[PDB]
Amino acid sequence: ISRLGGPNFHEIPINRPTCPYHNFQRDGMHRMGIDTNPANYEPNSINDNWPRETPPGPKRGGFESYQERVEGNKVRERSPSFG
Amino acid sequence: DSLAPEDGSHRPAAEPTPPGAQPTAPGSLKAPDTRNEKLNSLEDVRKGSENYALTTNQGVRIADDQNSLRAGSRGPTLLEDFILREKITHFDHERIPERIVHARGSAAHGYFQPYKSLSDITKADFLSDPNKITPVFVRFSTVQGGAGSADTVRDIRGFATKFYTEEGIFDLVGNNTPIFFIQDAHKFPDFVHAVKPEPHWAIPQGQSAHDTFWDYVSLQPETLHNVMWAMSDRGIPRSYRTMEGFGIHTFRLINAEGKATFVRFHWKPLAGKASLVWDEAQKLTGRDPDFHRRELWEAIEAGDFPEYELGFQLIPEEDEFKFDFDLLDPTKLIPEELVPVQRVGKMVLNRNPDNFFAENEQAAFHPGHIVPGLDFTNDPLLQGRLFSYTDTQISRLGGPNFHEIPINRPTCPYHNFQRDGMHRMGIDTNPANYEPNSINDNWPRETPPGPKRGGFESYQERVEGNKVRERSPSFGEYYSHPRLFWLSQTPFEQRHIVDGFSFELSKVVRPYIRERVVDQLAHIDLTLAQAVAKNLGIELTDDQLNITPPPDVNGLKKDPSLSLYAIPDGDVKGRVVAILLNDEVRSADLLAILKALKAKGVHAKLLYSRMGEVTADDGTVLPIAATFAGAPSLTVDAVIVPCGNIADIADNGDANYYLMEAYKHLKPIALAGDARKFKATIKIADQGEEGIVEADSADGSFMDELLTLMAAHRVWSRIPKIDKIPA
Amino acid sequence: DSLAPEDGSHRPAAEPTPPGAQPTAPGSLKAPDTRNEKLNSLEDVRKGSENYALTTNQGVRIADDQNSLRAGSRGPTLLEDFILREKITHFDHERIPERIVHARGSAAHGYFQPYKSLSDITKADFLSDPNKITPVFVRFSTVQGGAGSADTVRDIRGFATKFYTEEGIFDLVGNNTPIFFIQDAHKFPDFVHAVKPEPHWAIPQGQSAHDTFWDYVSLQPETLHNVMWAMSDRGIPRSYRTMEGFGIHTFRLINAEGKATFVRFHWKPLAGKASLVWDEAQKLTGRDPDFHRRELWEAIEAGDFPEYE
Amino acid sequence: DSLAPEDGSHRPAAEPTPPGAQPTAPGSLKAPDTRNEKLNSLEDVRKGSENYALTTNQGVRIADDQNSLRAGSRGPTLLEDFILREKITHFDHERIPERIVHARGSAAHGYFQPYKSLSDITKADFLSDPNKITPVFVRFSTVQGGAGSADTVRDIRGFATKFYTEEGIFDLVGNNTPIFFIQDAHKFPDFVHAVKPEPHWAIPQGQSAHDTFWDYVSLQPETLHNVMWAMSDRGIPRSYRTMEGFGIHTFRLINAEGKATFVRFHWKPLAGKASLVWDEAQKLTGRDPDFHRRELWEAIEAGDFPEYELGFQLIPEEDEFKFDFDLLDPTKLIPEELVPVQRVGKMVLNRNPDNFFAENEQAAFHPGHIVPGLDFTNDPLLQGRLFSYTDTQISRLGGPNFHEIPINRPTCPYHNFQRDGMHRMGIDTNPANYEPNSINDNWPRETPPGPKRGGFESYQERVEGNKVRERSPSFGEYYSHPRLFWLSQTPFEQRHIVDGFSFELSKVVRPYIRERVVDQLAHIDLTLAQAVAKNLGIELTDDQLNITPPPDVNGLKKDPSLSLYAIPDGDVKGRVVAILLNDEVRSADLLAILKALKAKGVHAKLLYSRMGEVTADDGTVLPIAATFAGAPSLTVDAVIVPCGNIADIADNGDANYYLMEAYKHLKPIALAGDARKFKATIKIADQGEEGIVEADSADGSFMDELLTLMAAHRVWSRIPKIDKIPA
Ligand code: HDD
Numbered sequence A: 001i002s003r004l005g006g007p008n009f010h011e012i013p014i015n016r017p018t019c020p021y022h023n024f025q026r027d028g029m030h031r032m033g034i035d036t037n038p039a040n041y042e043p044n045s046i047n048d049n050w051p052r053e054t055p056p057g058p059k060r061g062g063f064e065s066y067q068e069r070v071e072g073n074k075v076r077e078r079s080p081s082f083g
Numbered sequence B, D: 001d002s003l004a005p006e007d008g009s010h011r012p013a014a015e016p017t018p019p020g021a022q023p024t025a026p027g028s029l030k031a032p033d034t035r036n037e038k039l040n041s042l043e044d045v046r047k048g049s050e051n052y053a054l055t056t057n058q059g060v061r062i063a064d065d066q067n068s069l070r071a072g073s074r075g076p077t078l079l080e081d082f083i084l085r086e087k088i089t090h091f092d093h094e095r096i097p098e099r100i101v102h103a104r105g106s107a108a109h110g111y112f113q114p115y116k117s118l119s120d121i122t123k124a125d126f127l128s129d130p131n132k133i134t135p136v137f138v139r140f141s142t143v144q145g146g147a148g149s150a151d152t153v154r155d156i157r158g159f160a161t162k163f164y165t166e167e168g169i170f171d172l173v174g175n176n177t178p179i180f181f182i183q184d185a186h187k188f189p190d191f192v193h194a195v196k197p198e199p200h201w202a203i204p205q206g207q208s209a210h211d212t213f214w215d216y217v218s219l220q221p222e223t224l225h226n227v228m229w230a231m232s233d234r235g236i237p238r239s240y241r242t243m244e245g246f247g248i249h250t251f252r253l254i255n256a257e258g259k260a261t262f263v264r265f266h267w268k269p270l271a272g273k274a275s276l277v278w279d280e281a282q283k284l285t286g287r288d289p290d291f292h293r294r295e296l297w298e299a300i301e302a303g304d305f306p307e308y309e310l311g312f313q314l315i316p317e318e319d320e321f322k323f324d325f326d327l328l329d330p331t332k333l334i335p336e337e338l339v340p341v342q343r344v345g346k347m348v349l350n351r352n353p354d355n356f357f358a359e360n361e362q363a364a365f366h367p368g369h370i371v372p373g374l375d376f377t378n379d380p381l382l383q384g385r386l387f388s389y390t391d392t393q394i395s396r397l398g399g400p401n402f403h404e405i406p407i408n409r410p411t412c413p414y415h416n417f418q419r420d421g422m423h424r425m426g427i428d429t430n431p432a433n434y435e436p437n438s439i440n441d442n443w444p445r446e447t448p449p450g451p452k453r454g455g456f457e458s459y460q461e462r463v464e465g466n467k468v469r470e471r472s473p474s475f476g477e478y479y480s481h482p483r484l485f486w487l488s489q490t491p492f493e494q495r496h497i498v499d500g501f502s503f504e505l506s507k508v509v510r511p512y513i514r515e516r517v518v519d520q521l522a523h524i525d526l527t528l529a530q531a532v533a534k535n536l537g538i539e540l541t542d543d544q545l546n547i548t549p550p551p552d553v554n555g556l557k558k559d560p561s562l563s564l565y566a567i568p569d570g571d572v573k574g575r576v577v578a579i580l581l582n583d584e585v586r587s588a589d590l591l592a593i594l595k596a597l598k599a600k601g602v603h604a605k606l607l608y609s610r611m612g613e614v615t616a617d618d619g620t621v622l623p624i625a626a627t628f629a630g631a632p633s634l635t636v637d638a639v640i641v642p643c644g645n646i647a648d649i650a651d652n653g654d655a656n657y658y659l660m661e662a663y664k665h666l667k668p669i670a671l672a673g674d675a676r677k678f679k680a681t682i683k684i685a686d687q688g689e690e691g692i693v694e695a696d697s698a699d700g701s702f703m704d705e706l707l708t709l710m711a712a713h714r715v716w717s718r719i720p721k722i723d724k725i726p727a
Numbered sequence C: 001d002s003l004a005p006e007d008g009s010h011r012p013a014a015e016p017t018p019p020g021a022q023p024t025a026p027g028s029l030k031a032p033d034t035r036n037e038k039l040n041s042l043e044d045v046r047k048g049s050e051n052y053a054l055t056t057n058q059g060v061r062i063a064d065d066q067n068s069l070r071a072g073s074r075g076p077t078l079l080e081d082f083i084l085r086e087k088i089t090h091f092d093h094e095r096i097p098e099r100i101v102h103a104r105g106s107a108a109h110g111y112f113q114p115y116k117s118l119s120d121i122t123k124a125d126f127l128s129d130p131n132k133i134t135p136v137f138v139r140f141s142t143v144q145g146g147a148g149s150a151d152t153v154r155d156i157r158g159f160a161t162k163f164y165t166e167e168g169i170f171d172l173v174g175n176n177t178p179i180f181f182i183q184d185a186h187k188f189p190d191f192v193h194a195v196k197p198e199p200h201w202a203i204p205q206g207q208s209a210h211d212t213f214w215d216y217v218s219l220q221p222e223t224l225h226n227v228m229w230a231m232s233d234r235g236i237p238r239s240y241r242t243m244e245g246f247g248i249h250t251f252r253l254i255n256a257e258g259k260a261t262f263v264r265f266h267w268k269p270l271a272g273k274a275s276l277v278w279d280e281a282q283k284l285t286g287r288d289p290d291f292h293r294r295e296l297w298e299a300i301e302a303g304d305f306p307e308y309e
């Protein structure tokens, strides 16, 4: 945000994905992308909810975190195993 | 030079004066002896001006601040004019990004003091002794509009308090309604984009009355509870002094033993609760877009300090699952019938800023700014807010040194190993910029958590579960709070809610969105749903008429503390009355009028058809504050018309309209002697009407009645009668 | 999903429709067949939406855009939720500084064409041939108020036109009155500070009706001419379509022979001159603070294209 | 924890100490009693550390600064860890844009005082009385390299002085050569882009030895004069203390009567003029890239304050056109044989900063920052500079309030109607933010020009001409100044110039560029062009051999003030000597050596093949500063080898190489007793040679002879002898 002047650093040519990127994020300094979506929020009916979420799956699926089991108290503590 | 008037009338007296008696001024010039530790610590950056030479920022005296340097007096401007370039450069870069939300706000300095030590439930230093005075800086705001938008819009209001404690800044960043629209912070950009001006054309400003807002609401039923509050008169406060404040989220209090107590924060207005009515609010956005900001500033300048009582709803840790709603769900309120608000202390706002931009615009509040003795909870909205308020000031306030901006500086010590960053003010002399270090003997050093002056240690809450992007099933209930709120309102408050929904949905262009919202209202209450539907020309279906109402909340069918007006709590001090003058006022009426108002701390504004002065029957010269059109009834709480030469104003359309507008907006109207001829313009029966004070003269009896009406705020019984007034 | 209604009433017709008949829409969706060289050159950065998956800015598809990642469904939000942090980060930095002056403005795309070659008096390429059309982008504005201030205030109005000529950008940055308040640019910050919201309390918004403005005017008689215009009904135009526009300054036209001609620039409203009355203007700031922005947008959507000579 | 050593050896004594004796430290801790008005004014922002608790920036004490908050000690880090996020956030935004040019620089605080009042020729307050002390902040720099680039590169050096006067900041922003490369500011970006790292691959750093620079020079002959200076030993100063400083442009002095006098600013090093030799300079960028920064800091810590004499070349307005060159052409110097430098005052640099970033990196100097009594001229390079230095700190220092960053603040009063802007610190209480105003009685007010404390008014220079983008024809002469410089250098200086050009042109990949530069040199001097051509395997054509040399400069065929060394100005104080120890040093030699050096303020560094200690012949324990490889001969001015057990280091390759390197770089070498066995390493005849001090012991005249050699800086007569020597 300071180094590349804002949240649109993914629009700096070298950083751009070569795959599709569509979402409801708008504005910010030096915005290049001109969004034509009538909607800038979801859920929306005015654009029939596009762009839409995609269920996780074997290929071309949405990102879903591995459901790792978390068990412990809220601590600022180094694990003894790292000692 | 000597441009000031020789009589000295350009400078306001540095003593408390009523609204409009003097020109307003910077806080330190208006009330130089109002002090607190924070205000005193700002003295190193305050700059004067009287008797100083005009200079560049580099300290060079300027000889001619009227012209650019040019070759010949009609020649080209020269690049070597550094004085001109410095001045234009500074001007060219005056603006900073406004806040993403809550861009429109008004702020004041004050102080807080507890009523008793709360050491049994929290080790927070600022709550440890009734004699501990903590300086505060409070900013009230709207949410949707820009910094230049209007104050009396229909919206949620922000109520942010920065406490400068001896153990750190604690920011209590709340709103004027006890819940928020959404449950998880991940949807904030979605909700906010939906309510803000639509992206193609950036319309509308300061209004939720547009398709995208209601589109979102209709598809996200969790929003309905706060939507109900926004649609009620809670969305249009009379003033920041007459609204409630809530932290919304359940937080934790941590005591010296380490016991955690769940708490919800409340601010109770000691001036009582009061709101405008929609037509008055909307029209007031055009007549005075700065009405709340002005009201706040002038109340403080008059000594009508905004006073609030901090209140805590306290819930034992073992009571976590004893309600039929989840305590961590920010779309759910904790009814005061179930958990009473414990009165904890009082905050008084007693001084305006000196420079709005430097102190208000640049102030940075963040709910994550807590101190030992307080802690967070897992509320998924609060959790995500923690990331945002630090992040947003990197662009808004230009960097990570925003705590060095004067208004944001802690008044207690701050020392760490952080260095550099844009506009670094602090010059660190520590030999070390890392820890652990031996070269400065490890200073500054960590401090173990402890009863007082200890370091921050999080409450060791047990966390068990899988990494999931999942809403708790406990948050999946959307209609019982909205119903509870609805049933707790008076009949006229209910009417105003129906009118709020009806007006807003009429401005939604796609008819299907209106229908989908009406369907949601049918899940809350059939009467509400039917009333709104009828105003939209919509017919409830068979199925919609049979939707079973949601269950009561832990047996409650209502809670009067949710209504603005159900339980009397009016306060007339700081209110204002418009007095409509004529060219030969019956001085006896004004004397009685003004004496009685002054005994209750009610201000008056003398109005006429022109500026200047009029002379009363006995020769008293009366100075006019404004014209009828100039200071419309929208700006006052009541209207009094004294006797005298009524024929002077009887045919003044503006005078007649003043009374009709006030009448329509349920304001107390008092008519003395021949001023009773104005009864025909507002069609009042010969035998009178409750809400209209009328007498042969303005004696003490007439004034007590009017002041009684003012304490009740508005004449709600007049509602059925305004329908037939063309105003 | 099945969110849009089955009758398709959520989408505004892509054809000229009168004010209020359809929901307004982004220009390229509302009027897809309108084009100019500039509008065509913006096509490389226009982004659609229909039928695309919701992604992060790095192109990663999102599965659940309704929740943060937490340890348990009632647990703490995790720092590894990069999807949440990107989304909130972008949101957190959406605002840029508003313009120092003229922050409140409404704009539209269009085109310009000269009636005849003006090569005898200027070598400016965009005026060299009646057949040469120059795309434009025009922004109308007030002066004093913020970007969120009201449209029908009493104020001067800005009329800025960006000409995308074949020999460079030509910006004609004028106002709706033929003169300015002050004579020398060095006093611009003085004048603007006087008219803007006073520094202690930041009141009033979008209005010159306060002490510092009149103080400045009373001490600087050069301001009276433009103040006369502001106090007239010129200060409250009915619409950006019914006001005049002026470059104010005398500039020069240089022909191919090197001859200079002094020139003052004018815009004549082909819809004629028309203003509101003060009570209406002021009430309208409350009833519809976006009235001029809305009126301009809707006129274009209806085919009532704003035309200026 | 309490990590410092119990003997307190972690902390440097707060007293003057020689280089290497103690850990260096922040200025206010090393020399707390060294004060000035500016240093005292910085006390409001200086922050200590000792005995303070470690906190967040909001003042909250931290209990555990070793760990993030997680769910379980092996669990995921939680978003609610605001302590971690504040800390990483500040870290993440530490850097600010470096300066576009002169990004690499070292600074110090000091004071200036005039020798006599200059009231007859200037009304500048800081020059009005010999007892008026003006605080200064000086930054020396290279030009091309980034902030992390090396110090001893071949480049021009910047010499910027901020004078905190009573009538405003005056920044004298100069270089170490009396001319610049280009004439008009419009070409600054071209010249700078040509010298900086090439755009495709960003190579090379800190060097003009690349194609684009020499391409530009070859096409723009106006650059040749400063190129001659950069190719000479001027381009590789021994230290910022031993180089000259120049304002370059002709400015104006204005007196109280309104008379304008043309002035060129000079800084004379009171330590004398001294430079390295190229091989040494280049290798030193590798062995110690911070050599100049370090040397400056340690000189000040040792009490060897860098001292400079400000001098003025003054030229009456009537003599503007009396020279062969234009006074406003920045590529032309004013020969001191024509116009002597009149001594004006002394500047002493006596305290290092506390925090480099806060004081050095954020300091902003600009030549447009002048005060009443000074004025500009039409020099077209200066004219455009006035635009750049204010503009550039809008990004570098984040906005228009860069004058509020502590180091930049005037110490005199500054008041005006400028408001807001990012990071605004000053809280203005003026009711008015515009002038003329009546509401504050027009304060702050303009001030008429006058003899003292008056407003700034530009000198009324006559301007006459058409609006043109045209170089004055008087500027179209490019070879006489270069030739005058060349002819003023000693024979070894000329050789070094020839070597500089030859080395740099050998790094130009495109041969035609080398040829084109050679052709330009042939327009300056045939000897110079031939010697460079010979080193590049280029033959001059018959035409080139017949190019007529440029005319003398106003009759001068040389000016010895242009040479570093033609006129001896040696000063040994602050220089340093390497002493190569052995494991049984003759203590008597060491006592004589160290005391002689200390009596002249010359420092010593005791070197050995390992660290720790060695024991002398009498049991004296000798602390080792560094190893032979650890502190190479590049970092010292001379080398002394005492007697003792020479067989210990006789076959040490590093010890032998130490002497070979120092020998090659023309430094004085002194060998006592058996240390004379090292003569065979550097091939010294039995009889001895000028530049090598040798005797049976370090007694008698041994030290005086070595100090005489150090006073002459380098042994130039050894050049022919180092030609061979594999080192
Ligand atoms: C995750 C993002 C997020 C969410 C879920 C909320 N907010 Fe927030 N709000 C912000 C992100 C934010 C912000 C982007 O960080 C802002 C605007 C700029 C700033 O300084 O803070 C802010 C400003 C802001 C202000 C103005 C402070 C001032 O006057 O400067 C108040 C009173 C609140 N918010 C109150 C609320 C309430 C009580 C919330 C729900 C319970 C809420 N916010 C949810």
Ligand code: HDD
Pocket (backbone or CB within 6 Å): B088, B092, C099, C100, C101, C102, C105, C139, C140, C141, C157, C158, C159, C160, C173, C174, C175, C179, C180, C184, C185, C188, C247, C248, C249
């Ligand atoms: C010396 C400074 C100065 C002066 C004397 C004026 N302005 Fe200006 N104006 C500004 C400095 C400025 C500005 C600071 O540079 C602005 C605001 C932000 C922007 O980009 O430009 C600008 C904006 C601005 C705009 C809005 C452009 C847009 O829509 O983005 C218009 C229409 C004008 N100006 C019109 C004028 C006219 C007709 C002027 C008098 C003849 C005038 N201004 C004097």
Ligand code: HDD
Pocket (backbone or CB within 6 Å): D099, D100, D101, D102, D105, D139, D140, D141, D157, D158, D159, D160, D173, D174, D175, D180, D184, D185, D188, D247, D248, D249, D330, D363, D364, D365, D381, D382, D384, D385, D386, D388, D389, D390, D392, D393
């Ligand atoms: C028009 C552009 C321009 C030109 C023609 C000059 N430079 Fe400059 N220089 C700048 C534009 C600049 C600059 C971009 O504005 C800089 C870099 C960052 C800064 O603050 O100032 C600066 C830095 C800068 C510094 C560093 C100050 C520091 O330590 O912060 C010195 C010593 C000089 N320059 C000296 C000179 C001299 C003696 C020049 C020729 C006579 C010259 N410059 C030409």
